[PDB]
Design a binder for this molecule. Structure first.
Ligand code: DRJ
Lengths: 270, 270
């Protein structure tokens, strides 16, 4: 019954709105302007960066950065903190996916460990366009060029996210679509180390039917959107793998820089 | 129309049968199961290999294990010969895909270039089970044990493919399904360097529709098989990536000597 699938879709969309403070709808409203209400301050260089810590709250350094925790590192610990923040929002969302909390506690942990970053990059795309990305709840906007100009290793951390975002965003998905998609990502029975794969795949199948109908009803004219979206899951895994190896490089070139315990746990070069 | 999709399906199945000697239906009869007659020669040890090699249809080298070209190298090289063969079979199959030959020639070469490894492992799964893989047109069977026991570098070469095959084969696809799936892989759109993505994605759209109808008619009891199959591409990709990686490492094993050229030419890297 497609009626039961529509309810699941509404339920997941509802939980999504309740778990994620900055939706795609809000992100696009901020980026596309035509607004005086919430135009973001723009960071495209060191100076605007300094200024940025004025109209927008930023627990980081404004002045000199070199001999005082450089800008690259400052921006990096910022992403770090924001990522853990996202893991907590995604975890809250996960618990709302029917069946998720009734699974083996060990597998709940495994599903989150492997799904969190894939979800992070999917949602990160909502806050990006070809020119940059929204920051601090949408009050700021850091330029893609400014980011690609950071010190040797940090200079290329974000580029692959942008490359993915521009392609992914061309699919023109809205929050109700993404809510089902993120749920699908989490319930992957092919995650390494899962104990009970069957209960996980039973839920994903239900989620997949939900996503399929949702895309057919919401995008009547977009041929094979469902399949096209599912293939994007390959680009996500790649982004993760690529990010991981870059993180191993960072770890060795910056022995004075620290990683958040949560993020470190999830990570295992995995 | 459902008619254009069935025709496309039937057309691909026919060309697939004509292009690939060993069909999965053919290989499954041999593997797990009997169909008692002409049982494959089993390579499970060094002695069984030496014997099988000198008694199998392997046009290349003979058994010589004594400070002269180790077994692992001869096995590895052997898989290279068969891979070059398959590439030509994949190439002929590609040309039968409606619209393929009509694409920009550089684009045709690009699609084949980046799609042959994904296709090779996909079809390899057809000849594998959890304990081994069919060899020499199915006249042989090299056990998973003997393979994982090879030298340090070569022992971890095929294992990852066995793991993928185990999961992939659980989908229980047959040649009619695989025929369309392989064509979808070939007509990707995200291969690097493509010049005209539109016609490529347009054909894949048509192929995906065909694959979807085929799975629903051929496996009416398998819910969301279409979606599950597409997500298996995330695995194939990692496999390929991980594979070119070990490959580079192998290069850092065997190298020198003015003997073997022209042969090294015929292979390169694929
Ligand atoms: C439901 C989840 C919503 C996810 C929203 C993510 C916003 N974000 C963080 C993106 C990110 C960047 C870098 C990351 O690297 C770390 C922290 C490295 C340990 C990781 O977790 O792998 C991880 C995640 C982010 N936003 C921005 C804006 C500008 C510059 C950098 C930046 O990073």
């Amino acid at each position: 019954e497609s009626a039961d699938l529509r309810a699941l879709a509404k339920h997941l969309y509802d939980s999504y709105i309740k778990s994620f403070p900055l939706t795609k709808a809000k992100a696009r409203a901020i980026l596309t302007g035509k607004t005086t209400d919430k135009s973001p301050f723009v960071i495209y260089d060191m100076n605007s960066l300094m200024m940025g810590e004025d109209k927008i709250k930023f627990k980081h350094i404004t002045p000199l950065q070199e001999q005082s925790k450089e800008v690259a590192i400052r921006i990096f610990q910022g992403c770090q903190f924001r990522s853990v923040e996202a893991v907590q929002e995604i975890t809250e969302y996960a618990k709302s996916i029917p069946g998720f909390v009734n699974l083996d506690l060990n597998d709940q942990v495994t599903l989150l460990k492997y799904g969190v970053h894939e979800i992070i990059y999917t949602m990160l795309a909502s806050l990006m366009n070809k020119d940059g990305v929204l920051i601090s709840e949408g009050q700021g906007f850091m330029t893609r060029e400014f980011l690609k100009s950071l010190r040797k290793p940090f200079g290329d951390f974000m580029e692959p996210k942008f490359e993915f975002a521009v392609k992914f965003n061309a699919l023109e998905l809205d929050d109700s679509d993404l809510a089902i998609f993120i749920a699908v990502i989490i319930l992957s029975g092919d995650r390494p180390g899962l104990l009970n794969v069957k209960p996980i795949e039973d839920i994903q199948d239900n989620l997949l039917q939900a996503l399929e109908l949702q895309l057919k009803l919401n995008h009547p004219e977009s041929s094979q959107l469902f399949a096209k979206l599912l293939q994007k899951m390959t680009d996500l895994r790649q982004i993760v793998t690529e990010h991981v190896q870059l993180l191993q490089v960072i770890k060795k070139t910056e022995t004075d820089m620290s990683l958040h315990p949560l993020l470190q746990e999830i990570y295992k070069d995995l």
